[PDB]
Design a protein around this ligand. Structure first.
Ligand SMILES: C[C@@H](NC(=O)c1c[nH]c2ncc(C3CC3)nc12)C(=O)N1CCCCC1
Length: 274
């Protein structure tokens, strides 16, 4: 669980995003190109470093088949398993022809259990989106990107963030947009949007962005008015009705009226079997 920097050998960039990068490296103590591939996160500020230390301790404490696996650290860097299939967003866009409704329901279920495990750990993810879900195998996904994750204090069930969110606005719960309030129930909001991503196969032309522009002053405020009015994303083409109903349930105006991940899971399992 401790990796010497000199044995970690740079290959390429996997991702870039707010103050950090993920790289493909080979952990290669023999120096001969035979070592295992790992994904390595690092920062590129005094506070981001503190947040980074917290992100590591959170992921180190997580153990689930549906959460990207922590491998160790190097001292400054976070070492993780490397999933060559990349993110679900690109996987969906590429393998559209092979993934039927069941597969999509299998993914949904797997993400759901993962989120149920996070909630049980008192962890709010804050950035659930298909781009942050990694693909382990054609029938297995894992939640990643804990850079924004917060631990809820025992006394509270919500968290308030001082500075504005830097992710696409179309994934945020209304109370996050208006008051910077994040909770396990704002995660359920974002999960509804992830479901929408799965059943559109993250098609760009019917993405949240594209759909918002079609429904029509600051964009953040417009989106708020639309959601306040009860406007919502439409059923993805060929989307099963029961699955769309689940989205709308995740998109309940008030966080208390959104179902828990533990309630959702059973329902997704039944639809998967249905
Ligand atoms: C989502 C996050 N990825 C990870 O933490 C990964 C862990 N093992 C992986 N195997 C393959 C990949 C492919 C997708 C690039 N990613 C990962 C990431 O890339 N980013 C972008 C940079 C900032 C953090 C979020």
């Amino acid at each position: 669980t401790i990796f010497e920097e000199r044995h970690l050998k740079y290959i390429s960039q996997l991702g870039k995003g707010n103050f950090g990068s993920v790289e493909l490296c080979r952990y290669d103590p023999l120096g001969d190109n035979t070592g295992a591939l790992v994904a390595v996160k690092q920062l590129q500020g005094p506070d981001q470093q503190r947040d980074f230390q917290r992100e590591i301790q959170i992921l180190k404490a997580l153990h689930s088949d549906f959460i990207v696996k922590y491998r160790g650290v190097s001292y400054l860097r976070l070492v993780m398993e490397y999933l060559p299939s990349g993110c679900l967003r690109d996987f969906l866009q590429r393998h559209r022809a092979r993934l039927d409704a069941s597969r999509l329901l299998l993914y949904s279920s797997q993400i759901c259990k993962g989120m149920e495990y996070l909630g049980s750990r008192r962890c709010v993810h804050r950035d659930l989106a298909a781009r942050n879900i990694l693909v382990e195998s054609e029938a297995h996904v894992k939640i990643a990107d804990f850079g924004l994750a917060k631990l809820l204090p025992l006394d509270k069930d919500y968290y308030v963030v001082r500075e504005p969110g830097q992710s696409p606005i179309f994934w945020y719960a209304p109370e996050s947009l208006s008051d910077n309030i994040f909770s396990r129930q704002s995660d359920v909001w974002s999960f509804g949007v992830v479901l929408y991503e799965l059943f559109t196969y993250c098609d760009k032309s019917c993405s949240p962005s594209a759909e918002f522009l079609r429904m029509m002053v600051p964009a953040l405020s417009r989106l708020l008015e639309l959601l306040e009015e009860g406007q919502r994303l439409p059923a993805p083409p060929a989307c099963p009705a029961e699955v769309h109903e689940l989205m709308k349930l995740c998109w309940a105006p008030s966080p208390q009226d959104r179902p828990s991940f533990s309630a959702l899971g059973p329902q997704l399992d039944m639809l998967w079997s249905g």
